[PDB]
């Protein structure tokens, strides 16, 4: 019986979340990609291997491969935008 | 063979590419073609003087092609563009 009390609000909040998801899709469509090393901007330059320095020390390098990765919570489409906005509304990981 | 601490081959010329440089890119691949014409003149240079040591071309793209072919020598941090012999021929004091 309690559950039916919010038959209206629970609809308007879903509608607003959908609208904000669409706006976020328009704003951040595909802009969350990045390369493994923070020196290559294009996906064409993010290929092969690169030298990574552990803990910022220039004397301790390691060889790693660079991958053009995408953010786990992106805005590529409407479903991903809804998932990201839900995580934001839960107030967890929203600063990142 | 002798007069060389390692195993070599006079059939062609080895190519060294730095770790931080991706082979197969358009810049590298184009440089990797027209430098293949150096193999014949590498052999021609060595025919008159069989006592000739490493002959190397250090390109501005990063790759170094040397003759005779021999394997490269822990991670690799060699860049031909930072070598003292490359730097003096790049500019003046
Ligand atoms: C850059 O790469 C190109 C392709 O990998 C090379 O171009 C090819 O060179 C071949 C041999 O030099 C050519 O083969 C012969 O070319 C002559 C013309 O000079 C003709 O008799 C025939 O086209 C051919 N003969 C055969 C196959 O019996 C290729 O035609 C030529 N082009 C291709 C394969 O598209 C370039 O030489 C190379 N650049 C450098 C500097 O080495
Ligand atoms: C190379 O140098 C030697 C002297 O060291 C000289 O006799 C010779 O003519 C030169 N040229 C060739 C092709 O050997």
From Swiss-Prot, chain A:
Transmembrane segments: 9-28
Residue sites binding Ca(2+) per the record: 92
Spans within the Extracellular topological domain: 29-96
Free-text tissue specificity from the UniProt record: Expressed in pancreatic islets and in brain, where it has been seen in cerebral cortex, hippocampus, basal ganglia, habenula and thalamus. Expressed in the small cell lung carcinoma cell line SCC-9. No expression in skeletal muscle.
Localization of this protein: Membrane
Domain commentary: Each of the four internal repeats contains five hydrophobic transmembrane segments (S1, S2, S3, S5, S6) and one positively charged transmembrane segment (S4). S4 segments probably represent the voltage-sensor and are characterized by a series of positively charged amino acids at every third position.
Pathological association: Sinoatrial node dysfunction and deafness: A disease characterized by congenital severe to profound deafness without vestibular dysfunction, associated with episodic syncope due to intermittent pronounced bradycardia.
Record note on quaternary structure: Voltage-dependent calcium channels are multisubunit complexes, consisting of alpha-1, alpha-2, beta and delta subunits in a 1:1:1:1 ratio. The channel activity is directed by the pore-forming and voltage-sensitive alpha-1 subunit. In many cases, this subunit is sufficient to generate voltage-sensitive calcium channel activity. The auxiliary subunits beta and alpha-2/delta linked by a disulfide bridge regulate the channel activity. Channel activity is further modulated, depending on the presence of specific delta subunit isoforms.
UniProt record similarity statement: Belongs to the calcium channel alpha-1 subunit (TC 1.A.1.11) family. CACNA1D subfamily.
Known role: Voltage-sensitive calcium channels (VSCC) mediate the entry of calcium ions into excitable cells and are also involved in a variety of calcium-dependent processes, including muscle contraction, hormone or neurotransmitter release, gene expression, cell motility, cell division and cell death. The isoform alpha-1D gives rise to L-type calcium currents. Long-lasting (L-type) calcium channels belong to the 'high-voltage activated' (HVA) group. They are blocked by dihydropyridines (DHP), phenylalkylamines, and by benzothiazepines.
Protein name: Voltage-dependent L-type calcium channel subunit alpha-1D
Organism annotation: Homo sapiens (Human)
Whole-protein coverage range: 1010 to 1105 of 2161
Swiss-Prot record, chain B:
Glycosylated residues in this chain: 33
Domain remarks in the Swiss-Prot or TrEMBL record: The MIDAS-like motif in the VWFA domain binds divalent metal cations and is required to promote trafficking of the alpha-1 (CACNA1) subunit to the plasma membrane by an integrin-like switch.
Domain of life: Eukaryota
Disease entry from the Swiss-Prot or TrEMBL record: Developmental and epileptic encephalopathy 110: A form of epileptic encephalopathy, a heterogeneous group of early-onset epilepsies characterized by refractory seizures, neurodevelopmental impairment, and poor prognosis. Development is normal prior to seizure onset, after which cognitive and motor delays become apparent. DEE110 is an autosomal recessive form characterized by profound global developmental delay and hypotonia apparent in infancy followed by onset of seizures in the first months or years of life.
Lineage: Eukaryota, Metazoa, Chordata, Craniata, Vertebrata
Family: Belongs to the calcium channel subunit alpha-2/delta family.
Post-translational modification: Proteolytically processed into subunits alpha-2-1 and delta-1 that are disulfide-linked.
Protein name according to UniProt: Voltage-dependent calcium channel subunit alpha-2/delta-1
Assembly mode: Dimer formed of alpha-2-1 and delta-1 chains; disulfide-linked. Voltage-dependent calcium channels are multisubunit complexes, consisting of alpha-1 (CACNA1), alpha-2 (CACNA2D), beta (CACNB) and delta (CACNA2D) subunits in a 1:1:1:1 ratio.
Extra remark: Binds gabapentin, an antiepileptic drug.
The encoding gene: CACNA2D1
Tissue spec. comment: Isoform 1 is expressed in skeletal muscle. Isoform 2 is expressed in the central nervous system. Isoform 2, isoform 4 and isoform 5 are expressed in neuroblastoma cells. Isoform 3, isoform 4 and isoform 5 are expressed in the aorta.
Taxonomic source organism: Homo sapiens (Human)
Localization per record: Membrane; Cell membrane
Function: The alpha-2/delta subunit of voltage-dependent calcium channels regulates calcium current density and activation/inactivation kinetics of the calcium channel. Plays an important role in excitation-contraction coupling.
